[model samples]
Target: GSSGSSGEQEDRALRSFKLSVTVDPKYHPKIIGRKGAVITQIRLEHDVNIQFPDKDDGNQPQDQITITGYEKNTEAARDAILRIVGELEQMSGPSSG
Candidate 1:
């Protein structure tokens, strides 16, 4: 069904970015360890929402993480996530593996 709509909508709205990363499964536990201590730290530090896909969801992998918030916070969140990813990558290599 199609209904008649009104005039143009307002163009002014806050813009934000959604950042996502797919990390290693072995590192997922580390990132979300001890009742999400690491994630909570990131949220508190950056004041952003960081979401890891539900593990109970059968089709979803544990490595998928999403962070969304204001533009500035998103960048900060992305940097935090990348820092974690980098640490994980380092740990996965032969020296730590």
Candidate 2:
């Protein structure tokens, strides 16, 4: 369901994933939480690493979050990410702002 990054380095055993989420800017703050708390919780719960792109780029409204970890943890991470997205979708208002 995702692609992996290539590397032979000792710290390169983890795979990489880019998850795109389409949500309103207001929800963005919520999803990322204060100081990335929400995302941090998700990563800790799923046992994976996640990174959100810098907000300065205005090319896309969706969030580009990179997840990295072992195969099993990656799968669990993706599942957890999708679950959170689904929950957000359900809670989203008509305007999202």
Candidate 3:
């Protein structure tokens, strides 16, 4: 009973869950890194699958990103991604000389 009958265990594992976020589409290229090197590194090093739909999906905005993993790691990746977006947003904001 302590083994196969443990739905709670599996539930808890799956309960780790995923995160969906909206971020600046323009910053995606940098966040994803060249040829996906950055995303891959983030996944392996951080333990998460970062999913970005096709650029021209014609459905979701370019800012949409689906990050799936445990809450901690998922948020970790999300924070970093969003941070880049924030920086990009700042760059594009009205500049004062």
Candidate 4:
């Protein structure tokens, strides 16, 4: 017997996934956006969740960034974050330089 149609198969394939990455705490504010703008855009554009420790949270790792969504969305969000991190890192040159 047939299990379901292509639509059902595609829907089943859209399982939730989570991605985590660590970035410097200094860049946290910008990544999160001004008044929470950055992450809002990423979530809406990529259909993923971008989570970070609360500003006042004492236990969580401040640098740990988490993104949860479909596999594709998670990967796409990760890519965007990597690019932002790279740019931030590049701009944040060492004091020695």
Candidate 5:
């Protein structure tokens, strides 16, 4: 007797993850790049979604940028965003020897 009609499929589930970073709206254009290429690249590389506040949404906190994905992916996304923002700050800072 041979049995070959039974199979079990298991599914792997990952936790829903989210992260936030406060960035001035002034730098959003830079972060989003000339045609949104910069932000798009980050999302593709990290396999995450990045969200920004909408001007039409009254009273929305513009600085609270949100990243969502797996834990590590979201963390990586946040790192990339902050890196660009940090560079902007340096350039905008007062000249110092």
Candidate 6:
């Protein structure tokens, strides 16, 4: 019937993608924060999904992180993570002097 051709709604779906980054394995726990609070905050801030390999998973690389979101957001999130890790590295490292 012509009724089916009258009008219809259309939707445009945005692409959501994922990428991985390598971080220091020792800093993962701090990056995750207590009870995941740290990671949750990052997710909320960037509107991106972040994932890390299990510490107990011998087959996986603990230093690897998975970030998923729109192109820009993912890159932003990765930068933030790296920045935090760098800060941690400085704090724990020996004095340059």
TM-score of 4: 0.71
Q: Single out the weakest 10-residue window by summed lDDT for candidate 4.
A: 4-13
lDDT of 6 by residue, 1-97 (tens): 3555555423222235777888868887888887888888878898889988887886988889887777677888888888888788789578877
Q: Candidate 3: list runs displaced more than 4 Å.
A: 1-16, 91-97
Residues 57-93, model 2: lDDT tens digits: 7774445555677656666766655676667777745
State the lDDT of candidate 1 residue by residue for 12-87, as single tens digits.
3323567777676666667766887878887878788887777779597677677777667767876766687687
Which of the numbered candidates is closest to the native, going by highest lDDT?
Answer: 5
lDDT of 3 by residue, 1-97 (tens): 3665544446577546868878767677778887888778878777888888677786876778888877778888888888767777778589889
C-alpha RMSD of each candidate structure in angstroms: 7.9, 9.6, 4.0, 3.7, 4.4, 4.8
C-alpha RMSD between model 3 and the true structure:
4.0
Ranking by TM-score: 5, 6, 4, 3, 1, 2
Q: What C-alpha lDDT do the candidate models reach, one value each?
A: 0.72, 0.62, 0.77, 0.77, 0.80, 0.79
* Residue pairs with backbone overlap in model 5: none
Task: For model 3, name the residue pairs that clash.
Answer: none
Candidate 3: global Cα-lDDT?
A: 0.77
TM-score for each model: 0.63, 0.53, 0.70, 0.71, 0.76, 0.74
Give lDDT tens digits, candidate 5, residues 1-97: 9879967543233335667888888776678888888899889898889988876785987778888787778888888888888778889689889
Writing each residue's lDDT as its tens digit, candidate 4 over 1-97 gives 6685554346455655667777777777778777998788888898778888775886887887877788887888878777887878768576562
Worst 10 residues of 3 by lDDT: 1-10
